[PDB]
């Protein structure tokens with residue numbers, strides 16, 4: 583998230599049965615987190631309630647990064663005192679053996695794991711996609727209110743409770759698939775990047791498949807333009823990486839090594855067909871799928887200024903009808 587060898591040293595292995603801050607009885611690992619150990623504990627000081635504790639590495643870079651994370655979470659916590667906007671709740675922090683330790687509400691699994699348990703190319707029920715879409719847009723609403731850009735929304739960064747009724751947005755290879763085109767071309771960017779990533783996620787939640795599985799940044803742009811046609815001229819010109827992907831005449835240079843020069847990219851991606859799949863749907867679910875397709879069309883505009891607003895997303899037929 584962002585405001586709109588000594589870097590890897592100091593890992594701490596917490597033992598099962600260790601008590602932290604004279605209260606957190608560590609009883610299990612989670613596996614989550616990239617650089618820090620995230621453990622499950624019971625809070626002996628608060629009726630043995632379950633928490634997750636992230637133990638950050640003891641080095642300068644990750645200490646400072648930890649403090650920034652703490653600041654972002656406190657800002658969202660204060661902006662949303664009743665927890666209606668679906669961001670992860672930090673409970674408090676402490677220090678242990680020079681490690682900054684962050685204590686969070688416990689959650690069950692991330693949405694990548696939920697998709698895996700649905701099985702290969704299966705996806706969720708459209709009713710769950712509807713509910714999760716609303717919750718995600720509410721998270722977007724809070725982030726924008728707090729002048730925060732996530733910049734890496736994807737199933738791996740969304741956690742759910744045990745019943746899978748509630749999701750919380752959080753932040754910890756796959757990242758390229760969810761990247762907005764303004765980022766790829768190197769244009770100045772805004773809250774629109776997170777709306778884009780939410781669109782990519784929603785498609786994947788329903789189909790079980792990655793929307794834009796591009797091997798490179800060049801391939802990602804081609805796949806986006808296969809949906810929406812060629813990127814606007816004014817957008818191309820403002821990108822600091824435009825020369826990797828477009829020539830002096832703003833023709834797209836499709837790499838496949840061979841370079842195919844394209845003045846036009848005819849839209850060919852059939853989003854509805856891909857959404858429906860081999861399903862024989864009843865008219866009520868079929869209607870909802872059409873509405874999902876329309877929501878995605880409005881999210882996945884190449885120009886971020888022309889994407890659906892957060893409020894228009896919340897009031898879209900997919901959610902409301």
Ligand SMILES: CNC(=O)c1cc(Oc2ccc(NC(=O)Nc3cc(C(C)(C)C)nn3-c3ccc4ncccc4c3)c(F)c2)ccn1
Pocket residue numbers: 583584612614615620622634636647648650651652654655658669670684686687688689690691730732751752753754
């Ligand atoms: C059984 N239970 C479990 O398995 C289990 C595991 C579990 O693990 C964790 C999940 C998430 C986090 N952390 C975050 O999500 N941080 C965060 C949120 C945001 C948002 C809200 C702005 C998106 N930005 N940043 C965030 C992250 C890193 C940053 N770095 C620098 C600057 C700002 C930053 C902001 C964590 F530390 C541990 C939680 C609950 N249950």
